[PDB]
Amino acid sequence: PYTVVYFPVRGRCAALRMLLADQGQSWKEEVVTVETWQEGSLKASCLYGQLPKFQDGDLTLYQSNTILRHLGRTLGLYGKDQQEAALVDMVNDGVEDLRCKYISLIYTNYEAGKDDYVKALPGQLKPFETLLSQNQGGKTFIVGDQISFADYNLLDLLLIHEVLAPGCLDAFPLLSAYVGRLSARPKLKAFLASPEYVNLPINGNGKQ
């Protein structure tokens, strides 16, 4: 079945977990502590020496976006055709770019860089609002009329940004309604409210 191997944080596993939960999939969580990681064996066995590590049967995967694409490809959450598939990729790559900036702020210079980051935030969120406005008035999904792995990844990006900069979505009606709508999906809503999600820190250094 499915097994996600990761540190006890939401981090880069938050989106894929929301996906599995919303899709009614069952999975096993193999939690790796900082202590165990510092031992060295697991790290050495990891392709790029990092987590998350994912297992689907005897298929062992690394790279969070590879896991998302795999699940999207196998579960039918990758658009209706090649054109939509490309659009889904364009969204996910954009989500990834901002996530990298977020991760850098959180772990590299939270104190000194937070103000500048928050000031620049609107311009970084704007593209996703525009994408929504061009897809059935932002009433459905980020691409097409069916959910894709990029939706879960974007949802997480928006959720963690609300915590970082409360009210950042206020100027973006489509993104706000989008977060509420997706968060209201029955299985996702239950997951987001569960201790499994709630009692896990967003990041590993206690910053958010």
Ligand X SMILES: CCCCCCSC[C@H](NC(=O)CC[C@H]([NH3+])C(=O)O)C(=O)NCC(=O)O
Annotated binding site: 6, 12, 37, 43, 50-51, 63-64
Please identify which residue in 40, 49, 173, 180 interacts with ligand X, judged by CB under 6 A.
49
Residue 52 makes contact with ligand X by CB under 6 A: yes
- Known binding residues for glutathione: 6, 12, 37, 43, 50-51, 63-64
CB 158 within 8 A of CB 97: no
Residue 44 makes contact with ligand X by CB under 6 A: no
What are the angstrom distances between the C-alpha of 10 and each of 19, 34, 57? Answer: 13, 15, 23
Pairing of strands 27-31, 53-56: unpaired
Residue closest to 174 by CA, chosen among 141, 207, 147, 204: 141
Residue 63, Ramachandran bin (φ over 0: left; ψ between -120 and 50: alpha; else beta):
left
Which residues precede chain breaks (C–N over 2.5 Å) in the chain?
none
Residues between 5 and 24 with contacts to ligand X, criterion CB under 6 A: 7, 9, 11-12
Residue nearest ligand X, Cβ-based: 204
Residue 50 makes contact with ligand X by CB under 6 A: yes
Per-residue x/- track, 80-99, a second copy (CB under 8 A): --xx-xx--xx--xx--x--
The string of DSSP letters for 39-69 reads: HSHHHHHSTTS-S-EEEETTEEEESHHHHHH
C-alpha span between 117 and 30 (Å, rounded):
33
**Closest CB to ligand X among residues 43, 181:** 43
Residue 51 makes contact with ligand X by CB under 6 A: yes
Contact stretch for ligand X (CB under 6 A) within 61-69, 132-140, 153-161, 162-170: 61-69
Positions that interact with ligand X (CB under 6 A): 7, 9, 11-12, 34, 43, 49-52, 63-65, 93, 97, 204
